[PDB]
Design a protein around this ligand. Structure first.
Ligand SMILES: CC(=O)N1CCc2cc(S(=O)(=O)N3CCN(c4cc(C(F)(F)F)ccn4)CC3)ccc21
Ligand SMILES: [Mn+2]
Ligand SMILES: [Mn+2]
Length: 244
């Protein structure tokens, strides 16, 4: 069974999500053939030299899964597109490109974060092209940490004040470029299974959920595809004395 997660948005202000991810890693992920994280693991990222302790805690927990024999892969999200090869080494995770095609027990599956499918949000596309320009990233990463913190906090406030689903033709385009009948992504926070047609045959798009009140994962076995929602922490059972 292969596991897919996305859109956790880990941040120190939300310790329950972090505790839920740690429990996931020490329970579900240890039994997997592989773990794919399709972007937005963290709520923000300004470079791998950030001494934010949460980054180290998360890196050590993933590395433990990797050391238990479960390979771990990461595709960048729109929030954490600056995760680099230093963090990859500390966590044992492999960085993948923005589009990848996998063989999952015989079925060809395309995986991506999903933000590049949102071709109607032309404000987002302009922002994305900017911060994904290599010379603009290198210039930003070369600034002092305290400068990068101030820039990022200001850009986050500017986006909340300036406040989309995928384009259907963009879905078909990618699934036909890669000649696949299965696509897995996140980003939209709308967990669903969508049926469509691609390459003259039935096709499916599986969307992950964000970790808001509960966790979410897609599990792919040789027999089925599973969208699974679960609580973060171990919810102990206790009884209330209801009356007939
Ligand atoms: C829509 C969206 O995706 N948004 C909205 C707002 C925001 C904030 C962060 S961030 O806080 O994590 N952060 C901000 C600063 N980033 C930069 C900045 C520059 C430069 F200053 F040169 F333009 C270059 C390269 N990267 C890294 C990421 C992530 C994502 C999104
Ligand atoms: Mn997200
Ligand atoms: Mn996203």
């Amino acid at each position: 069974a292969t596991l897919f997660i996305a859109d956790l948005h880990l941040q120190t202000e939300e310790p329950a999500i972090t505790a839920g991810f740690l429990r996931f890693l020490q329970g579900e992920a240890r039994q997997a053939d592989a773990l794919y994280i399709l972007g937005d693991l963290f709520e923000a990222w300004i470079g791998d030299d950030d001494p934010n302790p949460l980054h180290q805690q998360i890196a050590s927990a993933i590395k433990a899964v990797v050391d238990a024999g479960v390979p771990c892969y990461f595709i960048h999200g729109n929030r954490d597109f600056l995760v680099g090869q230093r963090f990859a080494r500390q966590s044992g995770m492999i960085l993948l490109a923005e589009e990848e095609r996998l063989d999952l027990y015989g079925r060809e599956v395309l995986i991506m974060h999903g933000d590049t499918l949102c071709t109607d949000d032309q404000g987002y596309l302009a922002f994305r092209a900017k911060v994904h320009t290599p010379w603009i990233q290198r210039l930003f990463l070369a600034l002092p940490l305290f400068i990068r913190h101030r820039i990022a906090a200001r850009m986050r406030a500017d986006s909340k004040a300036a406040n989309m689903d995928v384009n259907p033709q963009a879905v078909v385009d990618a699934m036909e470029r890669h000649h696949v009948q299965w696509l897995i992504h996140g980003h939209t926070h709308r967990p669903a299974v969508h049926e469509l047609q691609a390459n003259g045959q039935p096709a499916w798009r599986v969307v992950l959920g964000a970790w808001h009140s509960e966790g979410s994962m897609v599990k792919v076995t040789p027999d089925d595809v599973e969208l699974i929602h679960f609580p973060f922490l171990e919810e102990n059972l206790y009884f209330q004395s209801h009356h007939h």
